[PDB]
C-alpha cells in the first residue's frame, strides 16, 4: 500500500502533488511510468498540470471529495485544463479560487473529507473554504507552525503530524478529522514537515524516497496503511 518515490530526483512529494480518494494532481515533468505507479498505489485518476505556471501543485492547491481550492495566480488555461479533466471523469467538485495574498494554499490548509484545519493567516477566507470543502473548518497551527498543510498528512483513515505535536493537540486533530489512526514522526530521513514529503489517501501513500525503515513503520501506523 505504500511506495517510495522521487519525482525526477526530488524527494519533496507533497510540495509537488496532492491527492484525494478520487484524483491526484501531479507535475507535468513526470513521465508516464511515474504517473502510472502513483495512480496504481493511490487508486486515483491522475492529472498532470501546472498551477500559476508552477509545478508546486501540492503547495499551491488543496482538494477533497467535495472541493478544489486554487490560488489567485491560477491561469485561465490551467483552470480550463482542470475543469475539463473533472468533467471527463464525471467529477462534480466545488472549484474555488481563494484570493489570498499568500498563494501557498496547500501549505496553509490541511483537509480530509470530514474536517479541515487552516492557518490563522487565512481566517478571512474561512467561509469560502467551508463552502468549497464542505466540512467543518477550524483555525490553528501544528507544533506551533501556521503551515499546517506542510506539517501534517491527513486522510479519511489517519493522520501523521510533525514529531513535536503534543498529546492535547493530537487529540484535537483526531477529533477534527474524525480518524481512528494518528501518530507523529518524520519523513525523508528526519524532515519534520511531513506534509511536504508524503501524499496519501485511505488506499495508499507515496512517500519521499529518502524515508527510512523506522519512519515508514510510523507512517504506516499513523495512516492505517
Amino acid at each position: 500500500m505504500i511506495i517510495r518515490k522521487y519525482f525526477s530526483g526530488i524527494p519533496t512529494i507533497g510540495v509537488l502533488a496532492l491527492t484525494t480518494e478520487e484524483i491526484t494532481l501531479l507535475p507535468i515533468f513526470l513521465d508516464k511510468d511515474d504517473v502510472n505507479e502513483v495512480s496504481e498505489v493511490l487508486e486515483t485518476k491522475c492529472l498532470q498540470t501546472n498551477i500559476g505556471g508552477s509545478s508546486l501543485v501540492g503547495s499551491l492547491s488543496v482538494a477533497n471529495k467535495y472541493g478544489l481550492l486554487l490560488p489567485k495566480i491560477v491561469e485561465d488555461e490551467e483552470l480550463d485544463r482542470i475543469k475539463n479533466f473533472l468533467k471527463e471523469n464525471n467529477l462534480d467538485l466545488n472549484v474555488e479560487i481563494i484570493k489570498s495574498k499568500n498563494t501557498a494554499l496547500g501549505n496553509l490548509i490541511l483537509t480530509n473529507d470530514k474536517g479541515a484545519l487552516i492557518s490563522p493567516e487565512l481566517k478571512d477566507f474561512k467561509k469560502d473554504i467551508e463552502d468549497s470543502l464542505n466540512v467543518e473548518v477550524e483555525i490553528g497551527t501544528i507544533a506551533e507552525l501556521p503551515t499546517v498543510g506542510s506539517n501534517a498528512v491527513v486522510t479519511n483513515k489517519g493522520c501523521l503530524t510533525h514529531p513535536l505535536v503534543e498529546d492535547d493537540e493530537l487529540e484535537f486533530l483526531k477529533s477534527l478529522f474524525k480518524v481512528e489512526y494518528i501518530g507523529k514522526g518524520t519523513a525523508n530521513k528526519g524532515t519534520t514537515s511531513v506534509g511536504a514529503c508524503i501524499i496519501a489517501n485511505s488506499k495508499g501513500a507515496v512517500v519521499g524516497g529518502d524515508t527510512t525503515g523506522p519512519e515508514l513503520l510510523i507512517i504506516e501506523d499513523a495512516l492505517g496503511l
Side-chain angles (χ1 to χ4, degrees):
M1 290 167 295
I2 303 195
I3 69 181
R4 269 189 191 91
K5 287 291 288 174
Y6 304 87
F7 287 177
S8 299
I10 297 165
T12 323
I13 305 315
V15 165
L16 294 175
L18 66 84
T19 196
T20 72
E21 301 292 318
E22 298 83 20
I23 69 177
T24 306
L25 307 193
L26 295 168
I28 61 173
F29 58 72
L30 277 195
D31 69 24
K32 225 68 94 239
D33 283 348
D34 287 344
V35 173
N36 294 335
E37 287 155 34
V38 171
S39 180
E40 179 180 29
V41 72
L42 298 180
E43 300 183 31
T44 50
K45 294 282 184 174
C46 288
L47 173 64
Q48 291 184 87
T49 188
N50 289 337
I51 300 177
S54 177
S55 49
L56 308 183
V57 169
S59 286
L60 291 170
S61 176
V62 169
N64 72 355
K65 191 187 84 185
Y66 295 109
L68 171 64
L69 310 181
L70 293 167
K72 65 184 175 160
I73 58 171
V74 69
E75 301 179 5
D76 288 351
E77 197 167 292
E78 298 166 342
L79 195 58
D80 290 351
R81 177 168 179 72
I82 293 166
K83 292 187 169 185
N84 175 257
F85 163 78
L86 294 176
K87 182 179 204 269
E88 288 278 306
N89 287 288
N90 202 29
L91 294 169
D92 186 358
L93 302 185
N94 298 319
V95 179
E96 168 69 1
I97 299 175
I98 298 297
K99 296 178 187 175
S100 50
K101 287 175 177 285
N102 192 335
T103 56
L105 304 181
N107 290 175
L108 297 168
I109 300 170
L110 179 70
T111 193
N112 62 9
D113 294 343
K114 297 172 281 180
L117 188 68
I118 71 174
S119 169
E121 191 172 5
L122 293 181
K123 165 172 184 335
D124 295 328
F125 296 90
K126 180 171 193 281
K127 186 164 167 34
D128 282 347
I129 293 168
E130 285 164 339
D131 288 354
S132 168
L133 297 183
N134 192 217
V135 296
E136 173 193 359
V137 174
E138 300 300 339
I139 292 161
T141 52
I142 298 275
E144 312 191 80
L145 303 170
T147 48
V148 299
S150 298
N151 284 286
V153 175
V154 70
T155 75
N156 293 330
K157 190 173 197 181
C159 175
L160 175 77
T161 73
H162 188 295
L164 295 182
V165 169
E166 294 179 21
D167 300 334
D168 49 3
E169 177 162 82
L170 217 64
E171 194 37 62
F172 169 78
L173 296 168
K174 188 179 188 201
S175 173
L176 175 59
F177 291 124
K178 292 306 171 217
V179 292
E180 299 298 341
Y181 297 93
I182 189 155
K184 56 189 223 169
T186 56
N188 279 337
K189 201 191 182 173
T191 296
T192 53
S193 42
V194 293
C197 300
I198 299 167
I199 62 174
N201 63 22
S202 72
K203 294 167 291 183
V206 183
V207 67
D210 295 319
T211 299
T212 70
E215 288 175 326
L216 203 60
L217 190 55
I218 288 159
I219 293 162
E220 280 160 12
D221 292 338
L223 297 180
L225 297 169

